Design an enzyme around this catalytic site. Structure first.
Site, PDB file in Angstrom:
ATOM      1  N   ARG A 140      59.896 -15.097  -0.210  1.00  0.00           N
ATOM      2  CA  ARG A 140      59.404 -15.691   1.044  1.00  0.00           C
ATOM      3  C   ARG A 140      59.259 -14.627   2.122  1.00  0.00           C
ATOM      4  NH1 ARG A 140      62.835 -17.642   5.634  1.00  0.00           N
ATOM      5  NH2 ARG A 140      61.531 -18.990   6.949  1.00  0.00           N
TER       6      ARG A 140
ATOM      7  N   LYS B  27      56.834 -27.919   6.364  1.00  0.00           N
ATOM      8  CA  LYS B  27      58.222 -27.819   6.794  1.00  0.00           C
ATOM      9  C   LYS B  27      58.526 -28.941   7.760  1.00  0.00           C
ATOM     10  CE  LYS B  27      59.695 -23.763   7.848  1.00  0.00           C
ATOM     11  NZ  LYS B  27      59.802 -22.379   8.443  1.00  0.00           N
TER      12      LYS B  27
ATOM     13  N   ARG C 260      60.164 -18.654  22.248  1.00  0.00           N
ATOM     14  CA  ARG C 260      61.166 -17.582  22.197  1.00  0.00           C
ATOM     15  C   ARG C 260      61.400 -17.001  23.572  1.00  0.00           C
ATOM     16  NH1 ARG C 260      63.538 -16.061  17.450  1.00  0.00           N
ATOM     17  NH2 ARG C 260      62.424 -16.872  15.603  1.00  0.00           N
TER      18      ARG C 260
ATOM     19  N   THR D  44      68.111 -23.286   4.383  1.00  0.00           N
ATOM     20  CA  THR D  44      68.782 -22.844   5.605  1.00  0.00           C
ATOM     21  C   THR D  44      70.298 -23.005   5.635  1.00  0.00           C
ATOM     22  OG1 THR D  44      66.695 -22.985   6.813  1.00  0.00           O
ATOM     23  CG2 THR D  44      68.683 -22.745   8.108  1.00  0.00           C
TER      24      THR D  44
HETATM   25  K   LIG Z   1      58.789 -18.908  10.197  1.00  0.00           K
HETATM   26 MN   LIG Z   2      62.388 -23.426  11.511  1.00  0.00          MN
END
Ligand SMILES: [K+]
Ligand SMILES: [Mn+2]
Ligand SMILES: [K+]
Ligand SMILES: [K+]
Ligand SMILES: [Mn+2]
Ligand SMILES: [Mn+2]
Ligand code: NA
Ligand code: NA
Ligand code: NA
Ligand code: NA
Ligand code: NA
EC number: 2.7.1.40
Lengths: 521, 512, 519
Positions: free
Chosen positions: C61, C258, C108, C316
């Site tokens: 990934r 996702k 961010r 995760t």
């Molecule tokens: K990402």
């Molecule tokens: Mn994420």
């Protein structure tokens, strides 16, 4: 080792296949018999002395068939049933309530009388011509050439090519020509024809009233004679049930209506019929002529399943022990039929000719009793309970919760009985719906509640004739002790066994909101 | 959207149950899984302990691997001071249990200050007492005198929570090679997986400690490294007549304990899956198998089982747990653990209250997500050999509670036994157990769903009045705690007469 | 002692199954759950990548939240160099897939100012001003925090919560200015540079697919990636956008959506329908929704993907402590095992492989836990329940798959060998969850790489030319699978396997199943 009673080894199976593989002929059933037995009364069973033996043998409900007989006749039968029943009343511990049911004529079609001249029955030969007439000059002069029947509008509902069945569907005719008021037919399936035989028109929308003038007279008489329930013939739709209810009226408001399903329309419209009715009879005689005989078991199982799901009484009827009209022992098919009706979930099973006119009425009753106890043990209670629970899971009703809790507790501790104190019957009806294996002893001061309780699997009604005690705790204990004495006398249990007891906490409690595990004293 | 995962509750299959789980279906207020907290420097003050109780702590665990009797006596005093600070309000008072976790047959290193052991480096293991406080990179002392009679060449030695590993190269000394290196501190734990360690189940120290527990009136003992039924009986014998009512919870943390599990379960009052040592003694990848097997068999028996160790480990240093930690707690509750535990998270960590609070939140969510209908069916099947009358009452009551979606089951009990039998059949609703026995109340925390309530009222002369008094108390508690409101329905289990030996009477009752 | 939890396998109830789990019942050699590894500084050398493949990595990934195209192209090159170093032996060669994980609509912070401490302490109750003034983009401190979401003031209100750095710091909006927000610190902590920001209460209006994402996706097409992990998918339309960008050239690239926000969970069914598979992106998901609810979303998503037969990945912090330690925590062991029991087709490593001190140990641990958990599945019940869910379908390949899986359970087959070019036949077998490995022999290299998305599919590339006789070509490919299984220790001579093939070259699926002894 030890062979557990009541198929309890089979009870513990994980799968239906293993349950069947574990069934054991050496596992003794319990003494109590849960499936109600309804007996048709007639010349063979009509006397007070025979009726006493019928009650002793297990009869719970006496069926009066109004397709035949006068009001005088039926009033006398009812009188005799009550004389026999009350002959046991001197011992309240052993007295068994007995219900009276009125089974309506309904929209029957029947032939006339065979002519005086010639043989007693006429032979209808395959391929022969037979004229159907409505001309009353022939109503007592039927023969192999001309057959009278009593359905005046028959020509309006049949067509060329239509099939006409006569005598329990044993003879069949095909319509070849229609006249204004007659039918020329050919004999398709031949046989010997007697007098006043039943006619079925399976292809036809028969337009006779659901409730005729005769039925209205009969229903009114039923109310006057204080019958407990009506078995309403040929119910095709909810509206037919409503008609019967309206005739019974305010005076008859507590009389239970059992709709008889005996034609295709009744099967198709079953759900609405069930909703409107107090219960159902699978009337297999007419049903198996109106629809192909090989399909009857489908309707039977569907109807019994749907009634079980609804908690409404269902009766399996007709030819269950038919050979016993002439023989002291049933056939293997008949033994199987009774067992399988009980396994299916029928609340009651019924006898017709076997008790009305047969040579062995007491033996027929006794055989239903024996088979029922064996089949009751052989039910797969654990699975049945889970599946009933699933089906009703949208309901959060408090009495259902008490009933389910009580039945579950009864399975776990192998209780010998569930004792239920009830005036309307409702709390006991809810326990019965969840199918404990132990008998439900329902103590009531309401005599009609007691008689009607026979419609429900496993309810053993007990009439309490004691006055109401001033202290609620004492009045409850009095009734519970009555059930304890009844159970001991009947051999359902003995000192030291355990029972589940359902009562109301206070006089004003609207259902049995209190459940106890109690040792038998 | 139905609350309490009730849509999933109605599923026919396990797969459909999972597919119906809904993050927007709110849990109920009641939290059924017991929370056990290890007390240490971060949590020992009366002030902190009060907040621990408010946050959901049910049992205070004293770990006797470290600390003097004086130290633990003071911790116990503080727990009781904090607990009793709430005692004047009968509606809100929460009983808090005290548990003693034994040292047991531990192996530990000496005193080093830290030392780096690097991969490939040689390390000598000695038993010479002259090196007790002189451990370094080349020489390590440990306290297991018989180590040589028990290890072979090629045997692996794990040090400091299994993080450092050594392989024995030659055998009163052992010369080893450092495999997994790291910084080594003083008096760290040693494991010898696959060696038949022959230390006593109950040492002289453990004897002292257990006698102290009796003196201090502890509620339960968590007995370390139980390998067999005989080990449990050794603990029981020391507790003796005076300690006969103290519950013994056997810790399963080695291969033999897993192998001999059924005899240990029979001999014990309950079980802890002691995952820390277990995951060093057996391959770490196998621990979940042992956990699920043990929880299942405890559930089947109706004996308390505790899931322990590293459940929220990262919260020693961080105010929020990892996703794996959230999952671990949820899955322990789904598995069927009666209690979940915190160790460093509450004993020494920077966020003890946050750790307790997070266990509470996760437990409520996971409790709703159980598949109660199937679980009940399967528990019933497992126990079907038993015809016990209280089990029958319990099953009937739980069944009724499912059917009418009752807000609680209220159980009047002196020994706890009637409430324990209700808990074993896993209702979704909380079980409010009213007792006049204070020890019964404290010990009740070992059981899923039991919310113990102490009744301090004098016994009323009329039985019916005394029963009503206690039921009323439960009604008041449930209302105050937000479990139910006027008009909700509850299941109530009582004795018909003062002489009844279990709750033989069940009612469905509206909340007044 | 029966191997492979076969005693537990025969249980009548779930409780009985659990009670029978046995630590002394050895798992099989084959490991069915795919392992996806995030590549980064700790893992991007060719030599480390060779060891990661040996340790069990199936999918590499590339996280496009960071790094230039130059950087990622070099990583991809290294992955391929390592992968192809094994190509000289077709019996042992393992295909390795390449996945592009998009930045998506991230928020961010900027860089901490040069002066003062490296991180600034945000103290509970203290004030903090959020600015969009770029003069502060590299001058963040405890008084002023810059972030890159230019439209933030439009979607947040007084009272809104702002989360910073993996949800560890929280702020409450007290005042709104035209281009600024005055906040109060709610949950304090130390703040470094370029940390992730979440706004769980807000309808964040950033594009599902930004100009940067478009460039990245087009780059993925050019670099021949096998799959895209699309960040922050909220609705079916977002999936359609990604699909459009990939376009005709990228039409065979698999899109894995996702799920990492509340809207994604709410609109899950339409997202699943539009996607090729799903990732439970638990990091962002557990900031966007209460952390205590993530397991509900995980189990729901895995269940629904299993019911659909579409790949699902659990991601995760699965082995997070292994970034710094050579052994995982007990919670981490449990998490991995439970994801496999839940039904995840693949499990993932992030920091554990990208930047950690023990990347190989992390991969090896996922491998070990997966095999144990695979055996501990209750296959009999699982199969029954999957069959029940799909019973409205009378699809012929589904029928072959169910029959083959059923046969595999009954005779305890050592493998199911499936000959497939598109992968479809093998995907249908995987959906019905055999315990035995599925050895899928294919001449399509992309099919082989993409097969890692499905539980139990062990892809094998056949490089042999097509034989003139169909029967000989079929035998050649079956023999290759036999040789692979024997070399890998999945089975030996005399064991039994299930073999799925087409009766003729023109069969559109594997319509032929055989029970065959291993030669
Ligand atoms: K990402
Ligand atoms: Mn994420
Ligand atoms: K009739
Ligand atoms: K200890
Ligand atoms: Mn009829
Ligand atoms: Mn330990
Ligand atoms: Na005649
Ligand atoms: Na009643
Ligand atoms: Na008790
Ligand atoms: Na700085
Ligand atoms: Na294919």
């Amino acid at each position: 080792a030890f062979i557990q009673t009541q198929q309890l080894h089979a009870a513990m199976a994980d799968t239906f296949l293993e349950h069947k593989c574990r069934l054991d002929i050496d596992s003794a059933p319990i003494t109590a018999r849960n499936t109600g037995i309804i007996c048709t009364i007639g010349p063979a069973s009509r006397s007070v002395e025979t009726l006493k033996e019928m009650i002793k043998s297990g009869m719970n409900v006496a069926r009066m068939n109004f397709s035949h007989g006068t009001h005088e006749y039926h009033a006398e039968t009812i009188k005799n049933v009550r004389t026999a029943t009350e002959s046991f009343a001197s011992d309240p511990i052993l007295y068994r309530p007995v219900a009276v049911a009125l089974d309506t004529k309904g929209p029957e079609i029947r032939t006339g009388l065979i002519k005086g001249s010639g043989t007693a029955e006429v032979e209808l030969k395959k391929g022969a011509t037979l004229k159907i007439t409505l001309d009353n000059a022939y109503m007592e002069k039927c023969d192999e050439n001309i057959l009278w029947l009593d359905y005046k509008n028959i020509c309006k509902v049949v067509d060329v090519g239509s099939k006409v069945y006569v005598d329990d569907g044993l003879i069949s005719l095909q319509v070849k020509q229609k006249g204004p008021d007659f039918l020329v037919t050919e004999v398709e399936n031949g046989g010997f024809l007697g007098s006043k035989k039943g006619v079925n028109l399976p292809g036809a929308a028969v337009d006779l009233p659901a409730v005729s003038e005769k039925d209205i007279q009969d229903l009114k008489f039923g109310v006057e004679q204080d019958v407990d329930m009506v078995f309403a013939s040929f119910i095709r739709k909810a509206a037919d049930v409503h008609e019967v209810r309206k005739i019974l009226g305010e005076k008859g408001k507590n009389i239970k209506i059992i709709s008889k399903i005996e034609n295709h329309e009744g099967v198709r419209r079953f759900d609405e019929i069930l909703e409107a009715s107090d219960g159902i009879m699978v009337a297999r005689g007419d049903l198996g002529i109106e629809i192909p005989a090989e399909k009857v078991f489908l309707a039977q199982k569907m109807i019994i399943g749907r009634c079980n799901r609804a908690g409404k009484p269902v009766i399996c009827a007709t030819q269950m022990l038919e050979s016993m009209i002439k023989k002291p022992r049933p056939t293997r098919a008949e033994g199987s039929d009774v067992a399988n009706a009980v396994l299916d979930g029928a609340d009651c099973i019924m006898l017709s000719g076997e008790t009305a006119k047969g040579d062995y009425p007491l033996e027929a009753v006794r055989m239903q009793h024996l088979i029922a106890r064996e089949a009751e043990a052989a039910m797969f209670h654990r699975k049945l309970f889970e599946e009933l629970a699933r089906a009703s899971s949208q309901s959060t009703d408090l009495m259902e919760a008490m009933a389910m809790g009580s039945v579950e507790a009864s399975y776990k501790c192998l209780a010998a009985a569930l004792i239920v104190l009830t005036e309307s019957g409702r709390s006991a009806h809810q326990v019965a719906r969840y199918r404990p294996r132990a008998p439900i002893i329902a103590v009531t001061r309401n005599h009609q509640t007691a008689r009607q309780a026979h419609l429900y699997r496993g309810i053993f009604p007990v009439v309490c004739k004691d006055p109401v005690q001033e202290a609620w705790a004492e009045d409850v204990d009095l009734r519970v002790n009555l059930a304890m004495n009844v159970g001991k006398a009947r051999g359902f249990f003995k000192k030291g066994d355990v029972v589940i007891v359902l009562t109301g906490w206070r006089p004003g409690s609207g259902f049995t909101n209190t459940m106890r595990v109690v040792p038998v004293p």
